[PDB]
Amino acid sequence: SMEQVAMELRLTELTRLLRSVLDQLQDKDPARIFAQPVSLKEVPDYLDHIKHPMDFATMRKRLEAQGYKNLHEFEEDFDLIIDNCMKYNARDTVFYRAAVRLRDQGGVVLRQARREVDSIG
C-alpha cells in the first residue's frame, strides 16, 4: 500500500536524523570509552553487574537496520551507556567522569533533536 510506503519513508527520514544525532553524541567521547561493548573476556563479571550493556557500535547496528521507531527508543539506549558506566565504575574514575561529561554535553544535542523530530513530524 501507499500508506505502508509513506510510513517507511518517515522511518527512513528519522533514521537519517538519528544518525546525525549519533555522530554528534559520539564526538563528545573523543577518548572512545563508549565506542565498543565492554569485553566479557576482560571484565568477566560484567553481566553480574550490568543487565543490559550498551555502547555506540551496538546503537549504530540498530540504527542501520532502522531499528529505532522513535527518539524515545534511541534515548533509552544512550542513557544505558551512561547509566551502566556510572553504576559499574566509581565516582573517582576516568570512566565515571567521562559518562558525566557525555551526559551533560549530550543533553544539549538531544534537546534540539526532540524539537526537530516534533517539528518535521
From Swiss-Prot:
Tissue note: Highly expressed in testis.
Domain Bromo per the UniProt entry, residue ranges: 9-113
Cross-link named Glycyl lysine isopeptide (Lys-Gly) (interchain with G-Cter in SUMO2), sites: K41
Compartments in which it is found: Nucleus; Chromosome
Function in brief: Scaffold subunit of various histone acetyltransferase (HAT) complexes, such as the MOZ/MORF and HBO1 complexes, that acts as a regulator of hematopoiesis. Plays a key role in HBO1 complex by directing KAT7/HBO1 specificity towards histone H3 'Lys-14' acetylation (H3K14ac), thereby promoting erythroid differentiation.
Subunit structure: Component of some HBO1 complex composed of KAT7/HBO1, MEAF6, ING4 and BRD1/BRPF2. Component of the MOZ/MORF complex composed at least of ING5, KAT6A, KAT6B, MEAF6 and one of BRPF1, BRD1/BRPF2 and BRPF3. Interacts (via PHD-type zinc finger domain) with unmodified histone H3. Interacts (via PWWP domain) with dimethylated and trimethylated 'Lys-79' on histone H3.
Stated name of the protein: Bromodomain-containing protein 1
Organism the protein comes from: Homo sapiens
Gene assigned in the entry: BRD1
